[PDB]
Design a binder for these strands. Structure first.
Lengths: 173, 284, 154, 467, 190, 190, 153, 173
RNA sequence: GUUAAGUCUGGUUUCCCUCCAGGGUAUCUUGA
């Protein structure tokens, strides 16, 4: 198996320096094949903190976060605040699976302590207002992938899919 | 024959799960819509038929018409209560049907998801359906051969797909349930009641005062006695497919949509369910 | 001479359409045409027939008007905008039962206006259930097309 | 979809009704119908809107036009409701009405061959099947319904509760022709069941209303302002009306216990205005608390930018009747004893009420005031006070009511059974036995012009006098 | 679906057939026994046992003297002697109506389910998004024949495939739980 | 299909023919009556008795006096001169209509059927695979003649082969069960 | 003669222009693709009722037809299917006019009355057997024209 | 609106000098979709002078010019005196349309004055002899374009489109 | 303070089909 890092994608951007391996190993499992994002992953029951992006366990089953499952290992200044799992690739909850998976993984989710000092009131946070999606490609796909503007002319496709595929629930607190 | 007609209400209250409720109500409606006729000419009413009660009861002596028009509403409420308390649920045939069908589908190499759901609030399904529409003006989705109300498979699938496409995008939704140019990957069956607490059908009312009214000057209550489905009635239905992928979004969506509505009048909290149980039988 | 289902539908709908002076009555009649044809299958001609007779709320000036509509060319259905629509659909069905000779006219106008005959009318209907139910749904489908063509929505 | 807010309310001697038009029936128990809540919310919204859009425009709109306006939040035949109600009651489980044994043979056996009226009457937790045929048999029933003596003498002392009890307590039986000991058992059982189920009057019913918002109509055209006005109206409904029947006579009066919310951007102001009513301590601060919201809705930070929309439609005062709040015909009081107050309001709303004979102190005038203020009134002169423009003594002139010439208000005011009362009472309390009565009068559109000072005098006199 | 008074066992629905349908079955059987070396002298016997009673509504597996079929048709039946073997091999009666009645009683015995199509943003019905569909009830029985010409693949087919075959999906609407069907061979379980 | 009116004898379908077909059969029977030593006086006399009544719709077997065929066309029949025996023998009435009406009645009797072709893997229609298709109903009767010239093989044919021909398969669509048909020789069936 | 294959071009040109929104074109294509088979199987009066029921005749959209008759810049107005059925109604009525089956004056004074519209329908009912045979090749031409000139939606 | 320099596709090597801005802005109109060259423009009634190709306008509908409509400027230097237009981008007859119509375009065209020296008789030029085709790919499709001969595992499959999509007319002087 | 009586209302309105597939492949001089 190989290590895998889960880059959450809310509207915020707190993902710059977190991983030891940015472009990954040979390839990520998430793809960009002119049909938008592929193999994007969903995580249910957790919410992300818009500041210090971290998946927090909030037992409500309506709460979900979609992100990118990349190749890498988080910078080794970490592993005290993350979750780490080996999953057989059938437990994954993917979206637009455009390939095959190693059938046993090593996933790295940015975890958080549930903050039992204030309650956890979540709120659905969609994605719109292009000025917020203009830089998603400039932050989490030109570093995560190299295909950005070497053969990509269909940027509008991944733009619209980011604008519609990725939604999530955030604690907003 | 009219002999079958006059003797229908005792049939209702003395068969109670073995009379065809569809036909029974459809025939009761002929009595209901011809009330002042069945109440005349020294009818062949026995000393136990539920109709000579209105020869005794006198609601208005000044007018012969108003007496009948009041007895008619009394009789409508009485029929609602009759259906409600007599026609109860025997869910052994439904258990047999679902277990036999589950074996059938195992013999077809499907992955099955048996789902039991319980009614919390008085539910309505198929209000524009025809069962009591000739009496109450408001029907219930009924299956005249299983002789039980049900939740159409199309309705459950449509609600589930609206959710999935609300949260996963109308493109992953089409990947799961297909589009006008591809087939769906998930199949649903109707939900039949398997076990109730005490009742299956329960009466209710809806009295619009100011629906489509201009002012307080034409407001007037118009009560609508109809039939609903009791609370704590349990429905089960299967969800089968071949590629186990489509089993992931059916896992999570199902316990989330049932706590919202699943039938009519849900914006005033009526068709509310709860996932009593779920179970997958993988067959890859 | 024998007029087919569509010719009979034209001849009836012409009498009706020219008797509903109020336009709301027309649109309500249209909404009855569009759904009673399916209600009759789902429930039966006899239950739905008497349901129509009840929703018509007859036994008023709303009955001699109906019996004059059979030959007046001036008869005007009056009543609530929901009663006239059902009374017009009742005239439709009675026009069929009479023109097809399935049931006599005078027997129908007698079984409508008082009670002792309504029960033997129930019996008669149960006798002629296959004679009627064989072909009335095509006539009512014709009426449905005529209605949702010649009338605008509400 | 998500929660918008979640209130925790409390009814008070509510008289809700199902198909049975009772709070309980052989099949279930329903103290609070969410459909009634939605309908009363819509009604109070259409009242608050004609209050606002008249204080700031002089204009009044038809109910259907206001509904076409708020269709975005309350739904219509062309759009699903954006808000989803959910009423949750403590102990909201199976509580059907089970009548076990009634033992009514004797009353049957000497009811035969005699067309005889039959009544019922609780005499010290024993009901007496008072035949009109000079015969009274004590019935020995037993049911799961435990009618306390307090509820019995509440129904008995209140002259309104004991009035609507006429439709349930009696049945005429024609056993002259041959009749059975089996059908008559059932007739009497039905009569007994009705009369019994009438007495399911729990005091202080406590539930928990929830609101859900779909998160699909957000800021389409003016959606947020519409939703905020709707929530304002919900608060106004909780503060000025009740649920159930006879709400214009105190019953069902709602009181706030705790208001929480989960989307501050739309609800913070409403939650604050509500929390204001978790601490009421004086009868003279409740008036100011009422007026704060009543006049802020019209003249506050965010009030209206959608009255200019061309969906609305003015009214035809010769054919349209529309209510709205005066915000000045209000008199709050203090009671500390709610049962006798509820029993008292009859004395202040009847034509022969001791509390009216001593405030209007005149026949031909009490009648007209109650007809104009007080809903429908049976009658079989007085119109000289309600005529539109005529010799004026007490200014109860009605916009179109002519002096004996055929018109619309010539009968709507006189011959129309379903007419709400403009004179509305309420018993609002705040979690400390604070227990303040509110009495107000909705300003209707069919009034030419009312002597607000004289009517206020009458109002406060009735409000002190009812206590 | 049936309503009757004066029957010991209560039935919510009854199997129904007519005489022209049995004549079509007899035509099929009589025609394939000539075009092949396979005669079915048992179905033919039962079906002619029935058909001898043509011209009168009868009953096979119960004792109903009258009923109201599909809440519109009053029929008066006559029982057939219990010497008749089991055809459906179930516990439900089987009426055989004269064809001018069974025609109506059958063509009004299918389920019409009115469906709709919901508008997304309004959550209300789309315009022109309403239609009906006829399904055929559960446990309906259709008779058919699977003929095969001489070959060696035909033998392997009729001995290997036609045996391990029992359940198929017919029709459309496969994804709302319709279309499942069981094939019972007369040769195997008559 | 028939919907009888003013006839107490309920039939659900009759046999319909026209005079323009009987006349062609009369041609076939006049010709080969001269080109052979085998005259067919019985059938020829039947057909002559029928064709004597041209210009009127007539019913041979039953007495209907009126009917409605294929749920569109109202015809007023007339019995045939004191029960002239039937040509075919099936107990179902046979109607001989004027030619104008028979044209469209016969057109209505034909069975038009849309079929589709479905992609194997995707369970969705193959773009291009939709077509209509027309059959002639079952129970239809055609008339033909098989003629032979003098030889020994012809005698062996007409005495050994034609006597064992009952069921052949005509036409196409043989996999849809279309085309199974039955030859019934006039010499022995009449 | 084959002048119906020319009248078809005239009427199809008029429609093709009048369906200013391409969805109406792609829909009228399917209407022409279906209703000819429907007229063959069921007859003319059934299919004509099924057409007038979905065309949604009204003084507004019926004027968009009477103008389309003579004028050349008319625009059929309504929903996609709502006008894909009125275009086909125009096809039919155009043939019935340019073949003198019915008089154009009798039609125009009947497409407006809201009263003699029923009388137009009855007049049509009298001629159904004739029309059912006359219009066959015209409608087959229209079908071919639509299949070719219009690409599938 | 936005600028458009339509290049002509000759058999010659001079098209490098019409513009220095060979890319334009953020978009190339004529795409490379692995199904060929899409969003191609052809204009009728014109021709191409064989010397320094510029569209000598004629009155012949059968004549055409098969070229590439590049998104951007003619470097503000060239086509400052030639046939230039602004179109609603629909009357822009694009062949093999595979994109968004920008709803308006300001197009620059290599135009030659009507060449009044001789009676101009057309001559059909049908590109073959792939040396011109192995040439055009390096001359522009890497200098004008930016998405070819870098990731292209298929170099000659996109090079073979020119064979059956650009066969213009000439006058051979 | 007492007597008696309840009365009125009893489902309406929209949506009735939309889209694709409309045939494909094979067979086409002999005597005078």
């Amino acid at each position: 198996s190989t290590q895998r890092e889960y880059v959450f994608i809310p509207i915020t951007n707190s993902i710059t320096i977190d991983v030891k391996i940015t472009i990954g190993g040979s390839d990520h499992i998430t793809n960009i094949d002119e049909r938008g994002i592929h193999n994007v992953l969903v995580i249910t029951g957790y919410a992300v903190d818009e500041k210090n992006g971290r998946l927090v366990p909030t037992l409500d089953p309506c709460d979900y976060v979609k992100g990118i499952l990349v190749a890498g290992t988080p910078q080794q200044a970490q592993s005290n605040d993350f979750l780490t799992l080996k999953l057989p690739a059938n437990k994954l909850y993917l979206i637009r699976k455009k390939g095959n998976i190693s059938d046993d993984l090593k996933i790295y989710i940015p975890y958080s302590s549930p903050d039992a000092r204030n309650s956890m009131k979540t709120k659905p946070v969609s994605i719109s207002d292009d000025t917020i999606v203009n830089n998603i490609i400039k932050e989490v796909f030109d570093k995560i992938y190299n295909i950005t503007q070497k053969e990509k002319v269909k940027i509008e496709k991944v733009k619209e899919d980011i604008k519609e595929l990725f939604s999530y629930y955030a604690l907003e607190q | 024959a009219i002999d079958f007609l006059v003797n229908i209400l005792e049939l209702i209250k003395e068969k109670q799960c073995n009379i065809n409720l569809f036909s029974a109500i459809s025939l009761t409606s002929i009595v209901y819509n011809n009330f002042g006729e069945f109440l005349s000419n020294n009818q062949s009413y026995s000393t136990n038929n539920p109709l000579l009660k209105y020869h005794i009861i006198i609601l208005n002596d000044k007018n012969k018409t108003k007496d009948v028009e009041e007895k008619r509403n009394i009789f409508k409420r009485e029929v609602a209560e009759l259906i409600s308390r007599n026609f109860k649920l025997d869910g052994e045939k439904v258990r047999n049907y679902f277990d036999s069908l589950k074996e059938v589908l195992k013999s077809l190499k499907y992955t099955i998801v048996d789902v039991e759901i319980t009614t919390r609030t008085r539910a309505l399904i198929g209000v524009s359906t025809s069962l009591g529409k000739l009496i109450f003006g408001s029907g219930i989705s009924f299956d005249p051969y299983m002789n039980l109300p049900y939740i159409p498979a199309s309705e459950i699938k449509g609600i589930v797909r609206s959710y999935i496409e609300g949260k996963l995008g109308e493109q992953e939704a089409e990947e799961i349930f297909g589009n006008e140019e591809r087939e769906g990957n998930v199949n649903f069956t109707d939900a039949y009641p398997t076990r109730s607490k005490d009742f299956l059908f329960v009466p209710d009312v809806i009295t619009p005062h100011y629906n489509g009214k201009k002012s307080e000057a034409d407001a007037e209550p118009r009560p609508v006695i109809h039939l609903t489905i009791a609370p704590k009635v349990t429905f089960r239905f299967l969800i089968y497919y071949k590629r186990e992928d489509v089993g992931k979004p059916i896992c999570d969506s199902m316990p989330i949509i049932l706590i919202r509505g699943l039938g009519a009048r849900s914006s005033v909290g009526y068709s509310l369910f709860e996932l009593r149980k779920i179970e997958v039988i993988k067959a890859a | 001479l024998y007029e087919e289902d569509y010719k009979l539908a034209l001849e009836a709908f012409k009498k009706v359409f020219n008797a509903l002076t109020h336009y709301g009555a027309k649109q309500a009649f249209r909404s009855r045409a569009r759904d009673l044809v399916e209600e009759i299958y789902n429930s039966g001609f006899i239950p739905t027939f008497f349901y129509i007779i009840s929703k018509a709320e007859l036994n008023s000036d709303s009955l001699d008007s109906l019996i004059s509509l059979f030959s007046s060319d001036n008869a005007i259905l009056r009543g609530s905008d929901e009663n006239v629509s059902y009374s017009a659909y009742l005239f439709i069905i009675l026009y069929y039962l009479i023109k097809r000779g399935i049931i006599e006219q005078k027997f129908l106008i007698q079984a409508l206006r008082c009670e002792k005959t309504r029960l033997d009318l129930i019996d008669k209907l149960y006798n002629l259930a296959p004679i009627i139910s064989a072909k009335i749904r095509t006539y009512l489908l014709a009426i449905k097309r005529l209605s949702e063509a010649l009338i605008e929505a509400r | 979809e998500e929660l918008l807010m979640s209130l925790k309310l409390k009814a008070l001697y509510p008289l809700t009704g199902g198909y049975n038009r009772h709070s309980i029936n052989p099949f279930y128990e329903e103290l609070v119908r969410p459909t009634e809540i939605k309908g009363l919310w819509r009604w109070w919204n259409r009242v608050l809107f004609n209050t606002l859009a008249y204080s700031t425009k002089g204009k009044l709109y038809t109910y259907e036009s206001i509904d076409r306006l708020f269709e975005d939040v309350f739904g219509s035949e062309n759009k699903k409701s954006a808000v989803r109600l959910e009423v949750i009651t403590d102990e909201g489980n199976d509580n059907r009405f089970e009548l076990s044994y009634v033992e009514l043979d004797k009353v049957i056996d000497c009811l035969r061959n005699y067309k005889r009226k039959v009544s019922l009457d609780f005499i010290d937790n024993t009901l007496i099947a008072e035949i009109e045929g000079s015969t009274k048999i004590p019935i020995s029933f037993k049911s799961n319904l435990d009618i306390d003596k307090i509820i019995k003498d509440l129904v008995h002392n209140n002259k309104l509760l004991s009035f609507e009890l006429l439709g349930f307590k009696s049945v005429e039986i024609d056993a002259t022709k041959i009749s059975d000991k089996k059908i008559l058992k059932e007739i009497l059982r039905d009569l007994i069941t009705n009369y019994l189920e009438y007495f399911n009057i729990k005091q202080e019913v406590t539930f928990t209303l929830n609101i859900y918002l779909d998160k699909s109509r957000e800021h389409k055209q003016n959606f947020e302002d519409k939703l905020k006005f709707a929530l304002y109206s919900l608060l106004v409904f909780i503060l000025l009306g009740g649920i159930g029947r006879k709400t214009s006579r105190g019953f069902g009066s709602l009181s706030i216990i705790d208001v929480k919310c989960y989307d501050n951007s739309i609800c913070k102001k409403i939650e604050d205005l509500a929390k204001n009513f978790l601490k009421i301590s004086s009868g003279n601060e409740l008036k100011s608390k009422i007026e704060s919201i009543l006049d802020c809705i019209k003249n506050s930070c965010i009030d209206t930018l959608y009255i200019e929309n061309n969906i609305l439609s003015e009214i035809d005062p010769k054919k349209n009747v529309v209510y709205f709040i005066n915000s000045d015909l209000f008199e709050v009081k203090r009671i500390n004893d709610k049962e006798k107050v509820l029993a008292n309001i009859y004395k202040a709303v009847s034509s022969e009420g001791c509390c009216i004979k001593s405030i209007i102190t005149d026949k031909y005038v009490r009648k007209s005031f109650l007809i104009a203020f007080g809903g429908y009134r049976k009658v079989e002169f007085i119109k000289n006070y309600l005529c539109e423009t005529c010799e004026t003594v007490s200014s109860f002139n009605i916009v179109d009511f002519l002096l004996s010439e055929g018109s619309f208000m010539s009968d709507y005011i006189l011959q129309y059974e379903h007419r709400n009362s403009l004179l509305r009472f309420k018993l609002i309390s705040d979690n400390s036995n604070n227990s303040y009565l509110i009495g107000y009068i909705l300003h209707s559109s069919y009034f030419k012009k009312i002597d607000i000072k004289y009517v206020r005098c009458i109002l406060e006199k009735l409000t002190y006098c009812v206590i | 679906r049936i309503i009757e008074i004066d029957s010991a066992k209560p039935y919510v629905w009854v199997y129904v057939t007519t005489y022209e349908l049995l004549k079509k079955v007899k035509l099929y059987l009589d025609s394939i026994s000539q075009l092949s070396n396979a005669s079915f002298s048992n179905l033919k016997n039962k079906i002619d046992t029935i058909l001898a009673k043509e011209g009168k509504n009868i009953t096979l597996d119960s004792d109903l003297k009258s009923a109201i079929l599909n809440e519109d048709f009053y029929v008066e039946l006559e029982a057939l002697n219990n010497k008749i073997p089991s055809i459906i091999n179930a516990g439900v009666p089987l009426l055989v109506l004269e064809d001018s009645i069974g025609r109506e009683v059958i063509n009004r015995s299918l389920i019409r389910v009115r469906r709709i199509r919901i508008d997304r943003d309004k959550k209300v019905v789309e315009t022109g998004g309403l239609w009906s569909e006829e399904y055929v009830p559960m446990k309906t029985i259709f008779f058919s024949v699977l003929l095969g010409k001489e070959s060696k693949e035909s033998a392997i087919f009729a001995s290997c495939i036609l045996r391990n075959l029992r359940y198929v999906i017919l029709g459309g609407k496969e994804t709302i739980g319709k279309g499942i069907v069981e094939l019972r061979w007369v040769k195997d379980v008559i």
